[PDB]
Amino acid sequence: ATRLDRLVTILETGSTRLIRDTAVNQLADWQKQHPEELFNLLSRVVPYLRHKDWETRTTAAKAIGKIIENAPLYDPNNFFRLESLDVATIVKYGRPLLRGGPVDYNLAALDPQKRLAHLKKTLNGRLGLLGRVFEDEEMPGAEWPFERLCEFLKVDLFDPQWETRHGAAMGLREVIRVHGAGAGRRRGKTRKENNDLNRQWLDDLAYRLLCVLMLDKFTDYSSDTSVAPIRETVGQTLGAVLRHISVESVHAIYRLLYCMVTGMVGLRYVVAVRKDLLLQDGDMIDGVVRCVMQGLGDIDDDVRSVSAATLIPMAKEFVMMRRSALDSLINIVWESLSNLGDDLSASTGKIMDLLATLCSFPEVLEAMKVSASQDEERSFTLLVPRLYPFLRHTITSVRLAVLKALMTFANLGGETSQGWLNGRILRLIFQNIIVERDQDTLNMSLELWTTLVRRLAARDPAILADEFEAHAEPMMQLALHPIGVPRHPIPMNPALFQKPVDGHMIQGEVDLVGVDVLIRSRISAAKAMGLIMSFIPTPRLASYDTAVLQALSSPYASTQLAAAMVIDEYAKNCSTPEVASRFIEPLQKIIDLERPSHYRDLVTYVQRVRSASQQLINLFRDHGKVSQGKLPTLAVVVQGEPEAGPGAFSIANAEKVVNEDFERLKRLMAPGQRLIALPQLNEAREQTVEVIEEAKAAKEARDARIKAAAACALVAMKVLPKKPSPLIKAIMDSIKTEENQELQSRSAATIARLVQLFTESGRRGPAEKVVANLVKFSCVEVAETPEFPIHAHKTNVILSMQKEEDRVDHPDAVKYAREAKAARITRRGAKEALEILSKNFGAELLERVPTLRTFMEEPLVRAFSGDLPPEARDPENAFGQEIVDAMSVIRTMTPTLHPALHPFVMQQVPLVIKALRSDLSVFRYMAAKCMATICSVITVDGMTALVEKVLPSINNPLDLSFRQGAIEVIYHLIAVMGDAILPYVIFLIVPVLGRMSDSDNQIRLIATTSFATLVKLVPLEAGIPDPPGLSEELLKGRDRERTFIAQLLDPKKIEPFKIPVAIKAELRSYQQEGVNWLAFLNKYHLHGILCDDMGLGKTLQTICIVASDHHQRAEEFARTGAPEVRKLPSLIICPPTLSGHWQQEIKTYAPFLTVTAYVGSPAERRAMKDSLDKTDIVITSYDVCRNDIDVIEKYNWNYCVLDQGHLIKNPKAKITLAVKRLTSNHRLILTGTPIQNNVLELWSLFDFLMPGFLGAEKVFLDRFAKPIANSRYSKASSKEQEAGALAIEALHKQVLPFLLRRLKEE
């Protein structure tokens, strides 16, 4: 078969969907190149529309779509007349279309044209044109180019083999959606005349479509609702066709519909694309309301799901021209909606939303009132509770719809809203709030509760308490429920939930979801109850006061935390904070008085400790041949159990046992048993230590968890302590160490309030302490503020890159990982704390509290703006860490700065830009990220500073300490700003690249990774917008970067470049193009792979480019004398047998190039140690290189080129190791194909091109390559395949621009 057939059959046999997408893209590209291939392409792909697979038909249809999209509209210069359609021909004369039966071999064997004619006759039969339900035995460029294909597609619309329906519907859609306007036109009739012919053709199509839309009832009830396999596709196709249809034809089709409807989705698919005609004609918009009048009460739920989807765009101009239908619509909506006992409500949500957005208008209030004037049953006063039963439906989308619709009805206002504001909804919404898992529902519902309770309070908080009281106490008790741990839950008594799923919450099955989600469910009820608690009168609160007192005193651990946050909510809305004064002594005692002997919530941990200890205690002394009842044993009763005695077992008992019972056991089991039991005793001691430490850590953390919220409450009530040490230190410890993110989010606000409260009080002292600790904590994570005493000695080191090299070696023990996760949690809290404290003061931020400004400036301006004293640059000093600390603060605080504080950071800008060149890298690391942050946030000024001072000197060779930062800052910039650097490409891309071609260890690497991420970032399919708000002096018409980006993105944009040197062999056009790309690579210190077919004159292009660069270096040196073009020979690597070949080629094309071959007798190879520089070109076999690499590596070289580089692929071979040692100004890779169906091939090669461009094997294998290969296997998996292939194309994009592949035909 042809290559085109292979490209087509991939659409069925493609291993991945993305490869088939590439196949259809290639087919469309071939169509673009060769429009004459359109019909062959269609006829080849069209047969797959009858294929069995869902995906294969979809792919063939999409192939047709892409192919026709790359084809022009047609222009030259029998039809079933539409009015013939009637109910009878479909309902009582037409053949039903259903599941395909056995193959019609008797007809399929005939010629396609004869078969088409026979199918046409049988189609005339099938439609009911004969007046009976007939039997098969009665019938046993001058014109539209797609006409025969269109006829086949239309005949395929009625195949019993239903796969043909699904495929051919999409195919005909792909024809008419793109070339609908041109369909049916023929020569003879002029354009104005054949417009009518096009109208008739599209009318015939609509006729057949309407015939299908009820003749075919094929169905799949597998899904509970969406039982439409092929009705929906043909309906959507009709919708696509409908946009071209003439208005009177739309009227006729609309008549056919609204008589047929009494295919219902056809009404939606015409409301999509002729909404204007419905309003303009006036009458035709009646059909959308009449359909819901007819259908919305039907028993069938298969069209109830559809009926809502038509109606959303309607009721805007309708309200003027057809006002009368509004009341009827809403009334029939509410009647159908109230069908309690029905099991689906999907369309109901959309209808509710449509009503809701209507309810924003006074006309809809009047619509309610006009119907309410006749009856109270349909009144807004009594109707709303029919929403109540829907609160706990299973599908979450309709839950969200319920919430938002309720909100809009709450927005209706008016005294009539009191009809359902009665306490029923007050209890029901809270019952929804308490246990709901889904975050979005919680988010909306808290707002809904707030608006509702505010509305009710607007009359009187007394009547609010009246509405709530009868349900109050059980609800509050539910709000004070405990919390537990996996496989030991605590459920809730369902008797407390009034009636109008949920089982995982009712049973308290914490195994399913993380406890943070449970705490979300708790804070939701907390915030819901807090507002009402504050609003209602204080004298009513006695029972509530007792409830919170119990929660404060209860042995259940969670209740103290819940109570503390509860009182925080209460205080934060109080008219005066002293109203909550009655909670001063409890919470302050919670933070002050010693935490309990036992935590009931932790009871399971205690039992686990007892069991895990006794299983050893009873083991070992019995293993010492001594078991007696009076010997030490842990008590049967465990403290915290229900009705447990005071003497019950506790963790302190375990501590008492393990302290001295181990040596007592050893002495007791002395005669022999100790020797044989000692290792078991060791692991037993380890196990006891593990479990005891676990329990103690849990208890301490829980103590902190209670105390943190307690301090939050105390701060909230504004009862500031006169001895602030415990409160502030508890706040700090909680902020540092809080495990739950929600409690951390609360504690951030706690401290952010506390600082302002201290500022009001005037006691700057404790404020200074807490803020100093806060900023001090920010340096904990090793990846954000490296330890000065650890890294201080390193010099001439690219310090930030150490994370790639050696930081992965640290995890040698659990002790390191523990502190690592602790650091992450600490910074997570710190960011929120600093963020909120930044925002709250805003423009006055540095003014309010000066000490933060002092910490932000003083070390940087005391150390820099000068030179470091000897102690400041002493690796064991006191001051050394301080500099990196302040720089950490600056690089953290920046993006939360208020705009008014911008002059401060711009005053800091002079310090860092000068400091960046410093000798001590430890400061350069902090400076790099800080500069990246300034550049990211205050865009214009940071960009100006960077481009105007940091960048322009980047090429100066003298100052190495500046040179390292000059690229390190660019790398951190690319990281921090991500793709947002893309508009700023016009100041970086070339000068940053130029760093690759300068010989300086570590510098070479960081540059390569920076350039690689840039290359990834540039779009493959988009241009560069103008940089936003940049001064003209910055830009100043720097189109060199634009040219570089253009040539990088497209080889065809590279300029021609003839040979400057006098090479005897002239370049042919393909040779010239290759030379053009090679020059473009040679023009910016890039390296790459050339992979031309050998028939194209392989060697000539390479030898031409190297000779050209040799001459250019010589002449530039004559003109400039610059070091950069220093004389070095070129070095070529090739097979030994090819050596001579190359030699002779050199003599032929370029006799001016002198040749030295590093070959001959071993003696002579030993003898030529220094002679090598005496000729322009050096010739080398792979293997003489592999031996004498110790020898050969002395001199640098101009060009290093691999002739047959395929041998180099191995990631470990001595040849690969050997070659890579060499250094030069240019290098290239010559191979037949770089990527020959294997991605693994490339890594080594690329490294050889660019150390540090793609990265090391530590990421190439683990991240991409291995999973790539795995997922690529057919037998592997089904899920990852598409993601795998997308990643494949990502690798192609990363590796394409520095590869040039050309076929010999080119």
Partner: protein
């Protein structure tokens, strides 16, 4: 008292009360299968909850795959409504459940041999074809599959209490063998 088993499948017998043209239905929708050359019943699945249906032309059906009685019933009713949608009338007349399947797990492995010897009159151990001990009991009539990893599967029950009882009866014998 031993720990209760956990229920895992339900089989239901359901009465449609109408004669049906099976061949027609097969070609009517995608979600079914029926061939006398393969089997008598129409095999059909639905998703919500995941279930399989055997339907017989005389007007009865056997329904499978529910975890719970209420779930089972819901599934059955949905099936019946589906039937109603097909175009041939039917009703949810009768409902019966048999062989409710449950499972239990305990720590200790079970000495199959010893048990089998104890109840040799009632139990057989044949590790040459099935790595489990079939234990037969009368009151309630329950088939117990006893496995050597501490796992017992209970079958033939009508009600969960039956399996409960069965497990309660067997559990002391288990405790005798660890």
């Amino acid at each position: 008292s031993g720990i209760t088993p956990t229920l895992q499948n339900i089989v239901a017998t359901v009465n449609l009360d109408c004669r049906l043209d099976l061949k027609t239905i097969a070609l009517h929708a995608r979600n079914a299968e029926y061939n006398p050359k393969r089997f008598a019943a129409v095999i059909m699945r639905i998703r919500e909850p995941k279930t399989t249906a055997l339907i017989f032309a005389s007007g009865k059906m056997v329904v499978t795959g529910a975890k719970s009685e209420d779930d089972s019933k819901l599934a059955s009713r949905k099936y019946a409504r589906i039937i109603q949608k097909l175009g041939f009338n039917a009703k949810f007349t009768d409902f019966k459940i048999q062989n409710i399947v449950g499972s239990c797990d305990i720590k200790f492995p079970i000495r199959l041999e010893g048990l089998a010897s104890k109840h040799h009159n009632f139990s057989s151990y044949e590790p040459e074809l099935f790595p489990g001990l079939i234990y037969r009991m009368i009151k309630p009539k329950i088939v117990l599959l006893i496995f050597v990893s501490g796992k017992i599967v209970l079958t033939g029950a009508k009600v969960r209490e039956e399996i409960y009882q069965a497990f309660e009866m067997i559990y002391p014998v288990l405790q005798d063998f660890r």
